[PDB]
Amino acid sequence: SRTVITEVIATADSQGRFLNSTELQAAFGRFERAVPAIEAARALTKNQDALVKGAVQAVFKKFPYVTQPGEKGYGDSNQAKCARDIGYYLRFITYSLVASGTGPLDDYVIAGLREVNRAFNLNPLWYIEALNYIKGETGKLLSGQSKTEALLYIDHAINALS
Amino acid sequence: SRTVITEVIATADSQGRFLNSTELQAAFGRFERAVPAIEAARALTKNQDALVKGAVQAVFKKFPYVTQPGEKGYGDSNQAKCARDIGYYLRFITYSLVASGTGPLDDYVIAGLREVNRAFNLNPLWYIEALNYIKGETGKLLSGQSKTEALLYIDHAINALS
Amino acid sequence: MARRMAGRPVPKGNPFLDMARELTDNRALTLVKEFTAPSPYQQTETYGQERIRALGTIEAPRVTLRAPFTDEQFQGALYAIYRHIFGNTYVMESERPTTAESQLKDGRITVRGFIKLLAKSEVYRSRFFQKTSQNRFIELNHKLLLGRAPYDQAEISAHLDLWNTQGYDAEIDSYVESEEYLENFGEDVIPYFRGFKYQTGQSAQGFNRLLDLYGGWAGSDTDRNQSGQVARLTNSLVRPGQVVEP
Amino acid sequence: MNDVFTRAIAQADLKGSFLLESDLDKLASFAKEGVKRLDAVAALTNNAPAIISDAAHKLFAEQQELIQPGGNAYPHRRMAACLRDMEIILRYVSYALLAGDASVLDDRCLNGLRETYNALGTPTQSVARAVQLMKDAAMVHLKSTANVTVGDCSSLYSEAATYFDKAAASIA
Amino acid sequence: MNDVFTRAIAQADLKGSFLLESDLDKLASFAKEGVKRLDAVAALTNNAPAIISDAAHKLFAEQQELIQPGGNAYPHRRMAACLRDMEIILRYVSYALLAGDASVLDDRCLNGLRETYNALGTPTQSVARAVQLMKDAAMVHLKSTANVTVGDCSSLYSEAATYFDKAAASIA
Amino acid sequence: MNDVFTRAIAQADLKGSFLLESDLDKLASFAKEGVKRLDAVAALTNNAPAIISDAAHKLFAEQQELIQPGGNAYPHRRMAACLRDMEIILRYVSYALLAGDASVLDDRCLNGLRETYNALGTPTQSVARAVQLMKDAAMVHLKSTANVTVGDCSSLYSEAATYFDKAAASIA
Numbered sequence A, B: 001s002r003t004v005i006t007e008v009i010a011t012a013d014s015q016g017r018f019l020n021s022t023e024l025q026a027a028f029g030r031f032e033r034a035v036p037a038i039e040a041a042r043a044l045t046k047n048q049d050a051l052v053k054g055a056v057q058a059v060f061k062k063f064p065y066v067t068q069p070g071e072k073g074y075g076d077s078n079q080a081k082c083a084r085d086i087g088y089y090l091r092f093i094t095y096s097l098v099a100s101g102t103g104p105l106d107d108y109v110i111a112g113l114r115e116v117n118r119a120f121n122l123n124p125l126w127y128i129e130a131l132n133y134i135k136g137e138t139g140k141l142l143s144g145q146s147k148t149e150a151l152l153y154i155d156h157a158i159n160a161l162s
Numbered sequence C: 001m002a003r004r005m006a007g008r009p010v011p012k013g014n015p016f017l018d019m020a021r022e023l024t025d026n027r028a029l030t031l032v033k034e035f036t037a038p039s040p041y042q043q044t045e046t047y048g049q050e051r052i053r054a055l056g057t058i059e060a061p062r063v064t065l066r067a068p069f070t071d072e073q074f075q076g077a078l079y080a081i082y083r084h085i086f087g088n089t090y091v092m093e094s095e096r097p098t099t100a101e102s103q104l105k106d107g108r109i110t111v112r113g114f115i116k117l118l119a120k121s122e123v124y125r126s127r128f129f130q131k132t133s134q135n136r137f138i139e140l141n142h143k144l145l146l147g148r149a150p151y152d153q154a155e156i157s158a159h160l161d162l163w164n165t166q167g168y169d170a171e172i173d174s175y176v177e178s179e180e181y182l183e184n185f186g187e188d189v190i191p192y193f194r195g196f197k198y199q200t201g202q203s204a205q206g207f208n209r210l211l212d213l214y215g216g217w218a219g220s221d222t223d224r225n226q227s228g229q230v231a232r233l234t235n236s237l238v239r240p241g242q243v244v245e246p
Numbered sequence D, E, F: 001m002n003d004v005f006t007r008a009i010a011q012a013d014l015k016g017s018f019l020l021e022s023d024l025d026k027l028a029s030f031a032k033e034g035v036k037r038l039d040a041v042a043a044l045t046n047n048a049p050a051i052i053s054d055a056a057h058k059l060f061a062e063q064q065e066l067i068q069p070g071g072n073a074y075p076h077r078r079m080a081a082c083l084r085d086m087e088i089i090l091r092y093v094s095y096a097l098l099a100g101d102a103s104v105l106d107d108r109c110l111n112g113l114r115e116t117y118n119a120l121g122t123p124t125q126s127v128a129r130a131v132q133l134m135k136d137a138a139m140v141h142l143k144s145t146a147n148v149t150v151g152d153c154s155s156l157y158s159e160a161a162t163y164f165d166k167a168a169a170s171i172a
């Protein structure tokens, strides 16, 4: 994981000198914006089921064929693991919000995304529409700066999917 | 490109030596089945329009939604552009047959394939279906060795799409 | 009566009739015809590389040497190394080091360590250091040990000061032990001209500078010229864009 | 490279004096209104694939010359190079937008593009047209009041426009 | 680098077409004389030291100033360089003879040779004379009906000759 | 890395004698069966993506902890590496099938794979079961009598089964 302070220690240990003004300043700013990130993560922690089921129904309604027989969206276990995948995306966005760094995201989802989507025939369009729906509900649930910081890690996940 | 001849020349040059018996034996094998390859190229060139049109219809048949309005496949522009893409793929399969190697495919289609597809939101599965259709028809068109060599280049393209 | 059954009369003399015939008659087939037409500036798959001198160097396969090798890929890797590191300069049989090759064959040193030994060898000095200014030495070090041209003047300043303070061995170590060599080539890949394809972080100029350094597949970093291995990128580095006359 | 603080500092040092209270005011205003700059830079970064997709679509629709066989963007490898160049240039405009000075762009980015593309034979005119298309496809992402606090940012729009114009005019 | 097949493929592609039937007839022919081509290449390869030695002997008997002190083949270093250049040129000629296309010569062998020899002060006249002597020596081994089932192969002699002239004209 | 012909060559050198007619007959038999061997390796390479996806589905069906958090394959890149390593072992098994020698896989990687999978803490029996499922899915594809002239290939199936068995046992 590469969080802001983790970036600080990493970019420091490579060279000789200690943590100068710039690194202390970056850690400082992260330490302010962390607490709003914590409350945003809490607000996002109350609504697992609503977010996941809304996103699932949104991606199903955008793609009518996956539901239809003969397609990989068909199935009880398939839809259950759809829900588990969206829960995974939600929890890893939560982890990123808590850490104030894209470390958990890059570690747990984005690393090896392409190859596995290749081998298991998953389409990133489904997950990208799910993330857009989650963006939509974060628009209403969260307000102001908390909304901004949540949306920034979210659309980072979009940028990773695309 | 990476023919048999060209790959041999490169591997002998990188070692800064002349062509020894192994290289000339490989070149002899290449020249020896140049005839089945050229015959398969001649067939796949003669039966051009039938192959392209059947492949396009197979893409639509397996992908109903693509023809539906308001999205990617609808519009005679996209229709003609699909036909152009399949003509490209078949052209490079016959180029590979003639060049007794995957030079032309790798140079034109295979290298840079996935970034360009993801940039234009083109689905690999469409092209995989078109090449499966071409595989089925060239099974009928060709018999003996030409059949096998063609099929080798088709599934090489299919694998690169996969 | 049948002609009138066609429909109400349409006034004649419309200047858009030819446009209608093109937009109506067999649009898909015609569109394929214009889509697949040749482009009046004809460029092959490798028109750009052939327009540069450097196609033979891009098409050249990457050569690697992992520890369990038998005989012949070793004899080829030695040729590739002595061709690249020494810059296509002839290395007579006496100059070729036997101890370093024995070390490499045993496996006590990786290919990167062997590159380091050859860079500290007397051939590399006598060709690139001893007969050339420091600018030309830094250019050659970048081109030979990194496959790229220098990106800016701060590289020259830093490496000149590193040499002036720590010596030739430290100067060479800054190239081979650098993170860039390790990420690009690592322990077991022979260096190659990678600056022809966009390398992450390069300036716009690095491509032009590598073209200026290359001099073709036949050419070399000889120093036996009538000139004496002058530096090529002296003004392209500190005046990257402009040109000045004395 | 140089942001605006470093640039003003260099101009002060060349005259060999402290920074005037006027330039202190300019830099204070820049720092106060750099939050809007952060927003604009984020708008370019999150929406980069969309901008490149739109610019590519309109460029190759406008010019069949690039994608026809024998064209300069045809062989499906030169095509990835085209999209990569668009990525690089939009990246560098985002850098020069966050910084505040075109030094990042015209130093780290575009001293050598004209003659690089001339050495590769590619049309530089089409590259300038691609950059203009990127500009047009980017401003629409850049003005969006969706999920961003409402305010006036016309100066930042002019700044992004002049960075895109500089890149296009240099490449051309 | 291009063999004859890849050259014809590129020509077809620039026209945006499949390969015509005359082109496939020609390539089928080229693959039908491939065995004779292989014998020619193997006669160049086996007799390489003999050709180099014959050409060197005749070149230095002819041009004696190359080996006087001060000439541009005097010490052992630049004599070994002579022999190395000649061996390389025969190597690339045999490469192009196998491929059937002179693209390897321009791509690699003759990419900067004129510049190297003008920089070094090497007399390009003498290098071209070496290549011509090499051609004369090689044809003797090419036309050797011994150990190969007799037939007509004058096309291959013409091809090898024109490769040698290509290299000689590029250098000189 | 070594093939069966060079095994005969090496043992002949070790005993110091010329190759015996018995081993020479064995090598002739192998060389004529090489036509079927080429189709076997071609089937493997052709069906490799389908085979690996199939075996991944069967494995993730039979073994589930690789899904749950804390399981080895739960982090996304880790099961990406699962698929990649499955592909690598299939590629090496295709190499071995073409060569006819099992050491090209074993001596190449299995020495370090044992200690690597011991240190990493992965369930190595799961990797052995992955090799077994790989073998089964490849066996399904190798018996495809369509597209190929019908012949006798029981020995090739036995060879593939034993190669995969040895690979798994070295893993196990």
Ligand SMILES: CCC1=C(C)/C(=C/C2=NC(=C\c3[nH]c(/C=C4\NC(=O)[C@H](C)[C@H]4CC)c(C)c3CCC(=O)O)/C(CCC(=O)O)=C2C)NC1=O
Binding pocket: A059, A060, A066, A072, A073, A078, A079, A081, A082, A083, A085, A086, A088, A108, A109, A116, A120, A122, A126, A127, A130, F060, F067, F073, F074, F075, F076, F079
């Ligand atoms: C580390 C975090 C992580 C991610 C991101 C992940 C993606 C993922 N989803 C999978 C299964 C799946 N996932 C889906 C869900 C998609 N398909 C439908 O169309 C939906 C619209 C859409 C949901 C948004 C489906 C249908 C499968 C079935 C494929 C199978 O049989 O495994 C699989 C195959 C293995 C398995 O989970 O059993 C992976 C690797 N897995 C992970 O462990």
Ligand SMILES: CCC1=C(C)/C(=C/C2=NC(=C\c3[nH]c(/C=C4\NC(=O)[C@H](C)[C@H]4CC)c(C)c3CCC(=O)O)/C(CCC(=O)O)=C2C)NC1=O
Binding pocket: B059, B066, B072, B073, B078, B079, B081, B082, B085, B088, B089, B108, B109, B116, B120, B122, B126, B127, B130, D057, D060, D061, D067, D074, D075, D076, D079
């Ligand atoms: C070297 C060989 C080569 C290939 C393979 C290639 C693929 C290719 N297809 C393209 C367009 C396209 N290709 C398709 C896909 C087809 N349309 C649908 O009818 C089908 C379902 C589907 C095929 C099965 C579509 C829909 C577009 C237009 C996409 C857009 O305009 O955004 C484009 C963008 C150029 C343009 O805008 O016209 C490329 C680069 N280009 C090449 O030079």
Ligand SMILES: CCC1=C(C)/C(=C/C2=NC(=C\c3[nH]c(/C=C4\NC(=O)[C@H](C)[C@H]4CC)c(C)c3CCC(=O)O)/C(CCC(=O)O)=C2C)NC1=O
Binding pocket: C099, C101, C102, C103, C105, C106
């Ligand atoms: C640091 C000083 C140093 C030492 C000590 C050294 C010895 C040495 N001998 C080697 C191989 C060898 N060494 C020998 C010599 C022995 N075998 C015969 O029976 C002889 C009786 C006897 C010699 C007195 C032989 C025959 C080999 C070849 C083995 C092989 O190629 O695998 C190797 C590995 C391959 C290579 O050198 O390329 C080393 C490192 N080299 C060094 O640079």
Ligand SMILES: CCC1=C(C)/C(=C/C2=NC(=C\c3[nH]c(/C=C4\NC(=O)[C@H](C)[C@H]4CC)c(C)c3CCC(=O)O)/C(CCC(=O)O)=C2C)NC1=O
Binding pocket: C133, C134, C135, C156, C157, C160
């Ligand atoms: C190994 C032999 C060798 C030498 C010595 C050499 C000189 C040299 N001087 C340089 C800069 C410089 N040289 C000077 C010296 C001048 N300033 C004043 O006017 C003085 C009159 C005068 C010195 C007596 C200065 C001030 C710089 C820095 C200019 C800059 O950073 O732009 C640089 C490039 C950048 C740097 O070093 O930071 C070189 C390469 N080049 C070589 O290859």
Ligand SMILES: CCC1=C(C)/C(=C/C2=NC(=C\c3[nH]c(/C=C4\NC(=O)[C@H](C)[C@H]4CC)c(C)c3CCC(=O)O)/C(CCC(=O)O)=C2C)NC1=O
Binding pocket: C046, C047, C048, C049, C196, C197, C198, C199, C201, C202, C203, C204, C205, C207, D066, D072, D073, D078, D079, D081, D082, D083, D085, D086, D088, D089, D108, D109, D110, D113, D116, D120, D122, D123, D126, D127, D130
């Ligand atoms: C860091 C700053 C930087 C930039 C911007 C940069 C651009 C750049 N683009 C290149 C290739 C290319 N770029 C293009 C794109 C052009 N062709 C069409 O006209 C399009 C309209 C147009 C895109 C706007 C093409 C086609 C090539 C390949 C040329 C060839 O292979 O012949 C190359 C040569 C390396 C390669 O072949 O991959 C460079 C150096 N390099 C840099 O270091």
Ligand SMILES: CCC1=C(C)/C(=C/C2=NC(=C\c3[nH]c(/C=C4\NC(=O)[C@H](C)[C@H]4CC)c(C)c3CCC(=O)O)/C(CCC(=O)O)=C2C)NC1=O
Binding pocket: A144, A145, A148, A152, D035, D036, D038, D039, D040, D042, D142, D143, D144, D145, D146, D148, D149, D150, D151, D152, D153, D156
């Ligand atoms: C982590 C990265 C990060 C970002 C991106 C960021 C943006 C940011 N934008 C803000 C408000 C603002 N944002 C803008 C920019 C808007 N003006 C126009 O409406 C456009 C839609 C758009 C720019 C073209 C403006 C004008 C304000 C209010 C400041 C003012 O007018 O006084 C604020 C102050 C409190 C808030 O409303 O959130 C922040 C912190 N802060 C961060 O820490």
Ligand SMILES: CCC1=C(C)/C(=C/C2=NC(=C\c3[nH]c(/C=C4\NC(=O)[C@H](C)[C@H]4CC)c(C)c3CCC(=O)O)/C(CCC(=O)O)=C2C)NC1=O
Binding pocket: C088, C089, C090, C217, C218, C219, C220, C221, C222, C223, C224, E066, E072, E073, E077, E078, E079, E080, E081, E082, E083, E084, E085, E088, E089, E108, E109, E110, E111, E113, E116, E120, E122, E123, E126, E127, E128, E130
């Ligand atoms: C594409 C493959 C390739 C070629 C063709 C090639 C030519 C070549 N010949 C060289 C030297 C030379 N080449 C010659 C050749 C001629 N001089 C004449 O008198 C004779 C006809 C003949 C004498 C043997 C000589 C004499 C030298 C030595 C020049 C010197 O060291 O001063 C050099 C470099 C000089 C140095 O080591 O610094 C090159 C690059 N190099 C290559 O990598």
Ligand SMILES: CCC1=C(C)/C(=C/C2=NC(=C\c3[nH]c(/C=C4\NC(=O)[C@H](C)[C@H]4CC)c(C)c3CCC(=O)O)/C(CCC(=O)O)=C2C)NC1=O
Binding pocket: B021, B024, B025, B028, E032, E033, E035, E036, E037, E038, E039, E040, E042, E142, E143, E144, E145, E148, E149, E150, E151, E152, E153, E156
């Ligand atoms: C291991 C590498 C390898 C080599 C070297 C090879 C050469 C080769 N030469 C052949 C015959 C031949 N070879 C030649 C060429 C020779 N005739 C002379 O007059 C010329 C001096 C000379 C041309 C330079 C000719 C004319 C034939 C008779 C068959 C034909 O014309 O195609 C044949 C066909 C068998 C036969 O009809 O005897 C082969 C396969 N094949 C290989 O797999």
Ligand SMILES: CCC1=C(C)/C(=C/C2=NC(=C\c3[nH]c(/C=C4\NC(=O)[C@H](C)[C@H]4CC)c(C)c3CCC(=O)O)/C(CCC(=O)O)=C2C)NC1=O
Binding pocket: F066, F072, F073, F077, F078, F079, F081, F082, F083, F085, F086, F088, F089, F109, F113, F116, F120, F122, F126, F127, F130
């Ligand atoms: C080219 C030859 C080669 C092989 C074969 C090889 C095996 C190998 N697999 C690894 C990672 C891994 N390999 C696996 C796969 C296993 N885990 C279970 O889920 C599956 C039953 C099973 C799939 C076959 C996993 C999950 C990891 C991740 C462990 C980690 O990253 O910490 C690693 C650690 C470093 C790395 O290479 O990424 C090695 C050395 N390495 C090589 O260089």
Ligand SMILES: CCC1=C(C)/C(=C/C2=NC(=C\c3[nH]c(/C=C4\NC(=O)[C@H](C)[C@H]4CC)c(C)c3CCC(=O)O)/C(CCC(=O)O)=C2C)NC1=O
Binding pocket: B033, B144, B145, B148, B149, B152, F035, F036, F038, F039, F040, F042, F043, F142, F143, F144, F145, F148, F149, F150, F151, F152, F153
């Ligand atoms: C282009 C690359 C290439 C391949 C692939 C190749 C293999 C190859 N397989 C052949 C037939 C054959 N192919 C097979 C193998 C199949 N038979 C079935 O029973 C098995 C399920 C299956 C094994 C995978 C067999 C057994 C023969 C006939 C040979 C015999 O008499 O046993 C033939 C001769 C055609 C004929 O007999 O009419 C060749 C050249 N050679 C090549 O140059």
